[PDB]
Amino acid sequence: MIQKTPQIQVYSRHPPENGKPNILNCYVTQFHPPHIEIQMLKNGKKIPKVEMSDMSFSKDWSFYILAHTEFTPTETDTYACRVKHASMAEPKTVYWDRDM
Amino acid sequence: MIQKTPQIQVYSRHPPENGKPNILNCYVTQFHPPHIEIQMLKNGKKIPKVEMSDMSFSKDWSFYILAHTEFTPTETDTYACRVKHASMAEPKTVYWDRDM
Amino acid sequence: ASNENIETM
Amino acid sequence: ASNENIETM
Amino acid sequence: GPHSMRYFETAVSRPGLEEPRYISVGYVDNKEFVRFDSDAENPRYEPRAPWMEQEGPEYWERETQKAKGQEQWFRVSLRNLLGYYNQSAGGSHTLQQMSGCDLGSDWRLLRGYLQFAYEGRDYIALNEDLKTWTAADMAAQITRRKWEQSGAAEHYKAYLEGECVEWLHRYLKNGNATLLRTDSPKAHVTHHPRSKGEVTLRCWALGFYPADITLTWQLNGEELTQDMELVETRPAGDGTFQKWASVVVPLGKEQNYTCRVYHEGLPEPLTLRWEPPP
Amino acid sequence: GPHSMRYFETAVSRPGLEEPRYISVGYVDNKEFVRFDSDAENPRYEPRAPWMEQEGPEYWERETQKAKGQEQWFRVSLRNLLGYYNQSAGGSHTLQQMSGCDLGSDWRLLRGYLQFAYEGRDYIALNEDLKTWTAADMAAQITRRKWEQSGAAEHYKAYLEGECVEWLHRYLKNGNATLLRTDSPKAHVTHHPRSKGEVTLRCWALGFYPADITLTWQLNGEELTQDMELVETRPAGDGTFQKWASVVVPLGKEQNYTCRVYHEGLPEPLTLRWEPPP
Same domain, E136 and E199: no
Distance of alpha carbon E260 from alpha carbon E187, whole angstroms? 9
Distance of alpha carbon F200 from alpha carbon F231, whole angstroms? 14
CB B28, CB B65: distance < 8 Å? yes
Same domain, E134 and E216: no
Distance of alpha carbon B71 from alpha carbon B12, whole angstroms? 9
CB B37, CB B83: distance < 8 Å? yes
* E115 phi, psi to nearest 5 deg: -140, 150
Q: What is the CATH number of the domain that holds E243?
A: 2.60.40.10
Residue E277 lies in a domain: no
Q: Decide which of E154, E181, E208 is a domain's last residue.
A: E181
B89 neighbourhood in chain F, CB within 8 Å: 134-138, 140-141, 144
Q: Beta strands F133-135 and F121-126: pairing type?
A: antiparallel
CA distance E201 to chain C (A): 47
CB F229, CB F194: distance < 8 Å? no
User: F91–E91: do the CB atoms touch at under 8 Å?
Assistant: yes
DSSP string, B63-82: EEEEEEEEE---SS--EEEE
Distances (CA, A) of F244 to A90, F199, F206, F214, F229: 30, 16, 9, 10, 8
DSSP tag of A33: S
Residue F39 lies in a domain: yes
DSSP tag of F57: H
CB A3, CB A32: distance < 8 Å? yes
F164 neighbourhood in chain D, CB within 8 Å: 3
CA distance A11 to chain E (A): 26
| Residue B94 β-bridge partners | B81
- From the list E258, E171, E172, the residue with the least C-alpha distance to E219 is E258
CB E4, CB E28: distance < 8 Å? yes
Same domain, F255 and F161: no
Q: Which of E92, E188, E234, E241 to mutate to test the interface with B (most CBs of B within 10 A)?
A: E234
Whether residue A21 lies within 8 A of chain F, CB to CB, comes out as no
Same domain, E175 and E186: no
Distance of alpha carbon A38 from alpha carbon E8, whole angstroms? 39
Burial string for E185-223 (b: 16+ CB within 10 Å, else e) reads: bebebbbeeeeeeebebbbbbbbbbbeebebbbbeeeee
CA angle (A63 as vertex; F77, F125 as ends), nearest 5: 45
* F17 phi, psi to nearest 5 deg: -95, -50
User: C7–E150: do the CB atoms touch at under 8 Å?
Assistant: yes
Whether residue B2 lies within 8 A of chain A, CB to CB, comes out as yes
- From the list E123, E156, E151, E159, the residue with the least C-alpha distance to E138 is E123
Distance of alpha carbon D7 from alpha carbon E175, whole angstroms? 63
Same domain, E39 and E151: yes
Distance of alpha carbon E241 from alpha carbon E245, whole angstroms? 14
B2 neighbourhood in chain A, CB within 8 Å: 1-2
DSSP tag of F18: S
Q: Which residues touch A68 (CB under 8 Å, ≥6 apart)?
A: A13, A23, A24, A25, A26, A40, A50, A51, F237
CB F251, CB F198: distance < 8 Å? yes
CB F257, CB F201: distance < 8 Å? yes
F95 neighbourhood in chain D, CB within 8 Å: 9
Whether residue F87 lies within 8 A of chain B, CB to CB, comes out as yes
CB atoms within 10 A of CB F150: 13
Same domain, F171 and F258: no
Distance of alpha carbon E141 from alpha carbon A90, whole angstroms? 8
Q: Which residues touch A8 (CB under 8 Å, ≥6 apart)?
A: A26, A27, A28, A29, A81, A83, A92, A94
Q: Which residues touch A76 (CB under 8 Å, ≥6 apart)?
A: none
Overall resolution, Å = 2.0
Distances (CA, A) of F35 to A4, F6, F9: 25, 12, 10
Least CB–CB distance from F87: residue in B1, B85, B88: B1
Torsion, CA E62, CA E67, CA E70, CA E75, rounded to 10: -140
CB E188, CB E205: distance < 8 Å? no
Whether residue F121 lies within 8 A of chain B, CB to CB, comes out as yes
Least CB–CB distance from D5: residue in F73, F163, F164: F73
DSSP string, chain E: --EEEEEEEEEE--STTS--EEEEEEEETTEEEEEEETTSSS---EE-SGGGGGS-HHHHHHHHHHHHHHHHHHHHHHHHHHHHTT--BS---EEEEEEEEEE-TT--EEEEEEEEEETTEEEEEE-TTSS-EEESSHHHHHHHHHHHHHTHHHHHHHHHHTHHHHHHHHHHHHTHHHHH--B--EEEEEEEE-STTEEEEEEEEEEEBSS--EEEEEETTEE--TT-EE---EE-SSS-EEEEEEEEEETT-GGGEEEEEE-TTSSS-EEE------
Cis peptide preceding E210, ω within 30 of 0: yes
CB F36, CB F135: distance < 8 Å? no
Q: Which residues touch F208 (CB under 8 Å, ≥6 apart)?
A: F183, F184, F185, F240, F241, F242, F243, F263, F265
User: Three-state DSSP class for F67?
Assistant: helix
CA angle (F98 as vertex; A34, F46 as ends), nearest 5: 75
Cis peptide preceding F2, ω within 30 of 0: no
Distance of alpha carbon E127 from alpha carbon B58, whole angstroms? 20
The residue ranges of every structural domain in chain B are: 1-100
CB E3, CB E103: distance < 8 Å? yes
* F84 phi, psi to nearest 5 deg: -70, -45
- From the list F225, F63, F80, the residue with the least C-alpha distance to F147 is F80
CB B35, CB B6: distance < 8 Å? no
Q: What is the CATH number of the domain that holds F18?
A: 3.30.500.10
Q: Decide which of E146, E162, E181 is a domain's last residue.
A: E181
* B5 phi, psi to nearest 5 deg: -70, 130
Q: Decide which of F119, F153, F181 is a domain's last residue.
A: F181
- From the list F165, F158, F168, F103, the residue with the least C-alpha distance to F126 is F158
Distance of alpha carbon E76 from alpha carbon E22, whole angstroms? 13
Distance of alpha carbon A61 from alpha carbon E150, whole angstroms? 40
Distance of alpha carbon B36 from alpha carbon B27, whole angstroms? 12
Residue type, F68: K
Residue of E nearest to C8 (CA): E77
Distance of alpha carbon E4 from alpha carbon E171, whole angstroms? 11
Same domain, E261 and E186: yes
CB A32, CB A2: distance < 8 Å? yes
F72 neighbourhood in chain D, CB within 8 Å: none
Residue type, A66: L
Least CB–CB distance from F80: residue in D3, D4, D9: D9
For domain A1-100, the CATH architecture is: Sandwich (2.60)
Distance of alpha carbon A77 from alpha carbon E27, whole angstroms? 57
- From the list E123, E24, E131, E130, the residue with the least C-alpha distance to E77 is E123
Q: Which B positions 69-98 lie with beta carbon below 8 A of chain E? A: none
CB F100, CB F5: distance < 8 Å? yes
CB E267, CB E253: distance < 8 Å? no
B1 neighbourhood in chain F, CB within 8 Å: 85, 87, 118-119, 121
Same domain, F170 and F202: no
Task: Taking the CA atoms of E254, E260, E261 and E267 in sequence, report the sign of the dihedral they define.
Answer: positive
Same domain, F107 and F137: yes
User: E144–A87: do the CB atoms touch at under 8 Å?
Assistant: no
Distance of alpha carbon F102 from alpha carbon F114, whole angstroms? 12
User: Three-state DSSP class for A44?
Assistant: coil
Q: How many domains does chain F have?
A: 2
Distances (CA, A) of F84 to E15, E93, F33, F115: 11, 14, 35, 19
CB A89, CB E138: distance < 8 Å? yes
Same domain, E218 and E258: yes
Distance of alpha carbon A80 from alpha carbon A82, whole angstroms? 7
Residue of A nearest to F117 (CA): A61
Distance of alpha carbon E203 from alpha carbon E246, whole angstroms? 6
Distance of alpha carbon E177 from alpha carbon F246, whole angstroms? 62
- Edge-to-edge strand order for the sheet containing E270-272? E222-223, E214-219, E257-262, E270-272
User: Three-state DSSP class for F146?
Assistant: helix
Helix (H) and strand (E) counts in chain F: 5, 17
- DSSP E strand stretches across B1-100: 7-12, 22-31, 37-42, 45-46, 51-52, 56-57, 63-71, 79-84, 92-95
- From the list E8, E126, E139, E9, the residue with the least C-alpha distance to E86 is E139
Q: Which D positions 1-9 lie with beta carbon below 8 A of chain F? A: 1-9
* F13 phi, psi to nearest 5 deg: -80, 140
Same domain, E199 and E173: no
Touching status, chains D and C (3+ beta-carbon pairs under 8 Å): no
Touching status, chains F and B (3+ beta-carbon pairs under 8 Å): yes
Distance of alpha carbon A12 from alpha carbon A23, whole angstroms? 6
Distance of alpha carbon E159 from alpha carbon E99, whole angstroms? 10
User: Three-state DSSP class for F111?
Assistant: strand
CB atoms within 10 A of CB F135: 21
- DSSP E strand stretches across F130-256: 133-135, 186-193, 198-208, 214-219, 222-223, 229-230, 234-235, 241-250
CB F33, CB F47: distance < 8 Å? yes
CB E257, CB E218: distance < 8 Å? yes
CB B99, CB E192: distance < 8 Å? yes
Residue of E nearest to C3 (CA): E159
Q: Which residues touch D5 (CB under 8 Å, ≥6 apart)?
A: F70, F73, F77, F97
DSSP string, E89-150: BS---EEEEEEEEEE-TT--EEEEEEEEEETTEEEEEE-TTSS-EEESSHHHHHHHHHHHHH
CB F124, CB F133: distance < 8 Å? yes
Distance of alpha carbon F51 from alpha carbon A78, whole angstroms? 40
- From the list F3, F4, F6, F53, the residue with the least C-alpha distance to F25 is F6
- From the list F55, F66, F83, F62, the residue with the least C-alpha distance to F22 is F66
DSSP tag of B1: -
Range of the domain at E263: 182-272
CA angle (E181 as vertex; E179, E185 as ends), nearest 5: 130
User: Three-state DSSP class for F167?
Assistant: helix
- From the list A5, A48, A47, A51, the residue with the least C-alpha distance to A28 is A5
Distance of alpha carbon F215 from alpha carbon F206, whole angstroms? 12
CB E190, CB E273: distance < 8 Å? no
* F63 phi, psi to nearest 5 deg: -60, -45
Distance of alpha carbon E200 from alpha carbon B99, whole angstroms? 10
Least CB–CB distance from A25: residue in F32, F231, F237: F237
* F119 phi, psi to nearest 5 deg: 60, 35
| Residue E149 β-bridge partners | none
- From the list A77, A100, A91, the residue with the least C-alpha distance to A12 is A100
Q: What is the largest CA-CA distance in chain E?
A: 75
- DSSP E strand stretches across F104-240: 109-118, 121-126, 133-135, 186-193, 198-208, 214-219, 222-223, 229-230, 234-235
Same domain, E125 and E31: yes
Distance of alpha carbon E44 from alpha carbon E62, whole angstroms? 10
Distance of alpha carbon F228 from alpha carbon E230, whole angstroms? 33
Q: What is the largest CA-CA distance in chain C?
A: 22
Angle between helices F163-174 and F152-161 (to 10 degrees): 30
CA distance E140 to chain A (A): 7
- From the list F36, F136, F42, the residue with the least C-alpha distance to D4 is F36
Residue E113 lies in a domain: yes
CB E233, CB E241: distance < 8 Å? yes
Instruction: List residues in chain E touching C: CB distance below 8 A.
Output: 7, 24, 26, 34, 45, 59, 62-63, 66-67, 69-70, 73, 76-77, 80-81, 95, 97, 99, 116, 123-124, 143, 146-147, 150, 152, 155-156, 159, 163-164, 167
Residue E78 lies in a domain: yes
CB F246, CB F202: distance < 8 Å? yes
Q: How many CA atoms lie within 13 A of F258 on its CB side?
A: 12
